Ligand binder design. Structure first.
Ligand SMILES: COc1cc(NC2CN(CCCF)C2)ccc1[C@@H]1c2ccc3n[nH]cc3c2C[C@@H](C)N1CC1(F)CC1
Ligand SMILES: COc1cc(NC2CN(CCCF)C2)ccc1[C@@H]1c2ccc3n[nH]cc3c2C[C@@H](C)N1CC1(F)CC1
Lengths: 225, 234
């Protein structure tokens, strides 16, 4: 079914799969801010599983492969969502409508906050569209753990979906009135930002390991369907 | 005369990048001595240090890089040096399934990596295998290596963006001349750029390994290397 969707049907399915914007628990300390962020991330993860299951082609994968992809991508997925919703707030990170944090607001957190702010500002300068954002978030889910699977026809399937999402991005750009040349330049600029999201996630994982959703929780959440 | 980076045709970009290529270096060990007395970590460290000197010369020849201030050139090299070494390795290991061709006299398998290095070797092998399956071309490789240098880490900003746009145009030109349809051109471009996020990942895991053990090039050493280049013979 996934591979038969037109570029317009792909966009519609991705937009419809979008998770809701959650609120933080109703001045802060390092301890209170860290607690609020941890709590928010845990609640967003449950919605992220529902979203992942609705990304065309994701449920065609085995439970083990779905878990591997989520284990590799969950923090990148949270981070891209954050940078998207913080676009219209220069110098601030919109974690939630009731949790808009500046750079000044924990050891090791400042470098991560600065990188997220710079990423949000880069997407704002590129005028990233909602339809492009859902494509990029789906690419992160299918790509981040693709080159790290232990053991062939299934890997080809993920790549086919990734090619379908690229086609979808191009279609969006052609409908927005970009010339063929502008289309490949914009495609490249967006995909290069995914290397920075990977980087930020790696720095974030380092921070968490120095104080992490296990394969077991992810499997139970995916199985709970 | 001197070409400004943004004025280069796709053929002139390919030619400048191919001409800027560093040489393939050899590992520095006596072939008359048993491999048991060599130290794999020592050989890799020595090779990387020698490759880093050639990398400085290469970076200075990447169109648009010398248009940046010394401070900005250092920042880009500090963030990208390991990804640059890694992409070079995965390119030259393409024709050796299951092995990493560090040098013509240093072809290492997964078992030799078992002697935190095993996870990094496995990721490099998967990247090399993916580039082999995609039939990555020499001309595409030089473009990707230059993109890594300019896109590294996390108006002068517009210039980098425009030089990156020029390199993308160059990649597309190479793909169009190879006979790919506009759609196949976009798909191949996306597949190559998505591998770059995995190369970033491998470099982050590599840096973590180095920080866990003067083994990481400091901002100061790189600044000195770029500045010392001014004193080299032309
Ligand atoms: C202290 O901050 C965080 C803590 C966690 N740890 C939790 C998830 N883990 C799961 C355990 C049971 F499964 C425990 C996760 C994320 C964050 C926040 C966070 C929080 C909510 C976000 N929404 N959108 C983006 C969000 C982000 C992104 C960055 C700013 N950050 C992550 C990081 F880089 C430091 C590791
Ligand atoms: C022990 O292995 C390495 C050691 C170093 N440290 C050195 C550079 N530093 C400079 C001192 C001050 F400037 C000391 C650098 C690289 C490597 C090798 C290495 C080596 C030569 C390579 N050529 N092409 C790719 C190469 C690679 C890629 C991976 C396998 N890497 C391992 C890694 F990720 C942990 C760092």
């Amino acid at each position: 079914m996934a591979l038969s969707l037109t570029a317009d049907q792909m966009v519609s399915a991705l937009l419809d799969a979008e998770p809701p914007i959650l609120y933080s628990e109703y001045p802060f300390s390092e301890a209170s801010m860290m607690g609020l962020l941890t709590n928010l991330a845990d609640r967003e993860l449950v919605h992220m599983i529902n979203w992942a299951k609705r990304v065309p082609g994701f449920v065609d994968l085995t439970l083990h492969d779905q878990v591997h992809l989520l284990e590799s991508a969950w923090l990148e997925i949270l981070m891209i969502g954050l940078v998207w919703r913080s676009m219209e707030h220069p110098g601030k990170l919109l974690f939630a409508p009731n949790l808009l944090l500046d750079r000044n607001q924990v050891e090791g957190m400042v470098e991560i906050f600065d990188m997220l702010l710079a990423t949000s500002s880069r997407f704002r300068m590129m005028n990233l569209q909602g339809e492009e954002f859902v494509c990029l978030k789906s690419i992160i889910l299918l790509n981040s753990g693709v080159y790290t699977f232990l053991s062939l026809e299934e890997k080809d399937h993920i790549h086919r979906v990734l090619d379908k999402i690229t086609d979808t991005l191009i279609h969006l750009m052609a409908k927005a009135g970009l010339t063929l040349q502008q289309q490949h330049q914009r495609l490249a600029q967006l995909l290069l930002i995914l290397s920075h999201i990977r980087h930020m996630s790696n720095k974030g994982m380092e921070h968490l390991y120095s104080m992490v959703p296990s394969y077991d929780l992810l499997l139970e959440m995916l199985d709970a369907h």
